[PDB]
Amino acid sequence: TGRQKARGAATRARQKQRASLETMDKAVQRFRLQNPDLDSEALLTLPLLQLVQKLQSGELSPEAVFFTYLGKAWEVNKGTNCVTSYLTDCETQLSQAPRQGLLYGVPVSLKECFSYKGHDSTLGLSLNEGMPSESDCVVVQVLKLQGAVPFVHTNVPQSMFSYDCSNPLFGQTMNPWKSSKSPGGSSGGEGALIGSGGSPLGLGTDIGGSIRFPSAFCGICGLKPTGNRLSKSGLKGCVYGQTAVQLSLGPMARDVESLALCLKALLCEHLFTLDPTVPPLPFREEVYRSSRPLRVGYYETDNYTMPSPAMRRALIETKQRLEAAGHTLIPFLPNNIPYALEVLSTGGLFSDGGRSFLQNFKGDFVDPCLGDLILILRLPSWFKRLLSLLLKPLFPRLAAFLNNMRPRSAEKLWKLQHEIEMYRQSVIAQWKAMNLDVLLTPMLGPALDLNTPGRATGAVSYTMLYNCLDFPAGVVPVTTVTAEDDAQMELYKGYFGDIWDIILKKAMKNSVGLPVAVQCVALPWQEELCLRFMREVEQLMTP
Numbered sequence: 001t002g003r004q005k006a007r008g009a010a011t012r013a014r015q016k017q018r019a020s021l022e023t024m025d026k027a028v029q030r031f032r033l034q035n036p037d038l039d040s041e042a043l044l045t046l047p048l049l050q051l052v053q054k055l056q057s058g059e060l061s062p063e064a065v066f067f068t069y070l071g072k073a074w075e076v077n078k079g080t081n082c083v084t085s086y087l088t089d090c091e092t093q094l095s096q097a098p099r100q101g102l103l104y105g106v107p108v109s110l111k112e113c114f115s116y117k118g119h120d121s122t123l124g125l126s127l128n129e130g131m132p133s134e135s136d137c138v139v140v141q142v143l144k145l146q147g148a149v150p151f152v153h154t155n156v157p158q159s160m161f162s163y164d165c166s167n168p169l170f171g172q173t174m175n176p177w178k179s180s181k182s183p184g185g186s187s188g189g190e191g192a193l194i195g196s197g198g199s200p201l202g203l204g205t206d207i208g209g210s211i212r213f214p215s216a217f218c219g220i221c222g223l224k225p226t227g228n229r230l231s232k233s234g235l236k237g238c239v240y241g242q243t244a245v246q247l248s249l250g251p252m253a254r255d256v257e258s259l260a261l262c263l264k265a266l267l268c269e270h271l272f273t274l275d276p277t278v279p280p281l282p283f284r285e286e287v288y289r290s291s292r293p294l295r296v297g298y299y300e301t302d303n304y305t306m307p308s309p310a311m312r313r314a315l316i317e318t319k320q321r322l323e324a325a326g327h328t329l330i331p332f333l334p335n336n337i338p339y340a341l342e343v344l345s346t347g348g349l350f351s352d353g354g355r356s357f358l359q360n361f362k363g364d365f366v367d368p369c370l371g372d373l374i375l376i377l378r379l380p381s382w383f384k385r386l387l388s389l390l391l392k393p394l395f396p397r398l399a400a401f402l403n404n405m406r407p408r409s410a411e412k413l414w415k416l417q418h419e420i421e422m423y424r425q426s427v428i429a430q431w432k433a434m435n436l437d438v439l440l441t442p443m444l445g446p447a448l449d450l451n452t453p454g455r456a457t458g459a460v461s462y463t464m465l466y467n468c469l470d471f472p473a474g475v476v477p478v479t480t481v482t483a484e485d486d487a488q489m490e491l492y493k494g495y496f497g498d499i500w501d502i503i504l505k506k507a508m509k510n511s512v513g514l515p516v517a518v519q520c521v522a523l524p525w526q527e528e529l530c531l532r533f534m535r536e537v538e539q540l541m542t543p
């Protein structure tokens with residue numbers, strides 16, 4: 001009965017969305033009258049490096065590449081529901097774009113949390129509706145300064161604490177390969193859009209896998225750098241001052257070269273001048289372009305989330321293809337993964353028991369795809385500890401998350417923050433002892449059914465670990481689900497048998513033809529190495 005403002009918020013958001021799309025369309029069709037004989041699917045097809053080349057040499061005009069992609073985005077949006085807003089003024093930015101910039105005339109999609117002047121960054125929440133950004137976030141300024149034309153705000157799951165992608169304002173985003181499936185999240189609108197040719201390049205945030213999931217589920221590249229490689233200034237979030245598990249932002253694109261282009265474009269003196277709290281580490285092209293044989297750690301499971309057959313096959317086929325290229329593959333597994341997930345990561349994100357998070361939800365509709373998170377955090381802490389002590393014998397994995405989602409005293413979070421530092425060094429010591437360069441990893445895939453990710457929390461294990469360690473981690477699509485793999489899904493039993501295993505069992509069925517990826521990891525500040533290795537995987541696993 002107190003959803004007055006929630007119902008009103010949503011109505012405004014949908015008309016703002018509808019007006020954006022209607023504006024986008026009447027823009028595109030104006031253009032197509034004056035540009036009929038023009039090779040739009042050669043343009044949309046063109047890889048980004050190609051595209052910048054023609055924009056810089058002046059073979060294609062910026063308006064052509066803008067209004068061609070603008071049309072395509074609008075078309076793919078009809079199946080997917082992945083464009084929140086059309087960024088108003090981008091037509092004006094196109095004409096006054098910095099001409100010798102590294103992304104001159106490249107149109108760029110932005111996850112909604114990236115502040116853009118005059119536009120809401122709602123995060124699917126009614127409390128953030130009707131509250132336009134006073135100015136562009138630091139990375140958007142650098143984008144615009146480097147010649148790019150940010151043009152849409154792509155959708156996110158309510159609060160971004162979910163690897164599905166629905167909210168009560170703009171509704172549910174769907175996977176462009178199969179509309180019964182989730183596109184991933186929280187950068188789901190990004191993946192859906194880029195993954196269907198709606199944008200050559202875009203920007204996401206990751207805190208539990210939120211770049212890597214949608215990249216994998218929608219079959220594109222994506223990199224989560226080290227937390228403070230790039231400027232978090234101006235990004236809209238649920239919680240501020242949680243530093244233990246640090247959020248990280250990075251690129252999402254159709255290929256690995258695009259990603260390396262994009263970092264090289266942002267890591268410049270503009271970024272470091274505009275935000276001196278970021279360490280002025282220039283993009284080292286020498287390391288990215290190296291062809292030195294790699295010592296590559298690997299594991300085909302984390303013993304926590306049982307991989308799908310597709311994942312397992314993707315991991316082994318890459319492992320072996322890499323061996324044939326001459327890289328040295330070494331079995332490697334970080335110590336105490338259950339501890340990192342159940343105690344450290346979970347404790348880090350909900351150190352305060354959720355009370356900060358939850359005030360975003362007061363008087364709002366709770367999206368079904370958040371599952372039982374809001375209800376669980378809303379429970380009082382004595383009931384969490386009691387209920388944990390009952391479940392532990394029967395369901396340790398679930399009892400352990402519950403035990404570490406209670407509020408704690410400043411003394412206890414100092415102790416947790418120390419264990420994270422020590423754990424990070426603990427895994428670095430494993431790494432250095434086996435002299436590895438990079439680390440090959442499975443990656444959750446194929447894409448889950450809709451409203452499944454919310455009730456399959458174990459499956460964050462593959463990605464979350466490296467938010468916890470704060471290692472640069474990216475994904476590359478390597479293969480597509482065979483019927484042989486989809487059939488092998490009915491022998492899937494999981495390592496625990498609790499409901500997260502059961503939900504994801506069914507969630508991952510009926511996924512023939514969907515893409516499946518692997519994860520690449522490096523030590524901190526070695527983003528350029530992570531991309532060298534991702535690029536290697538990309539070359540060796542193309543069909």
Ligand SMILES: O[C@@H](CNc1cc(-c2ccc3c(c2)OCCO3)ncn1)c1ccccc1
Binds near residue numbers: 209456457
């Ligand atoms: O389902 C859970 C409650 N939900 C969560 C969710 C997440 C979570 C954290 C980071 C994420 C994310 C999800 O989504 C992707 C991006 O980042 N972490 C811990 N708990 C549960 C617990 C006890 C009993 C029953 C059910």
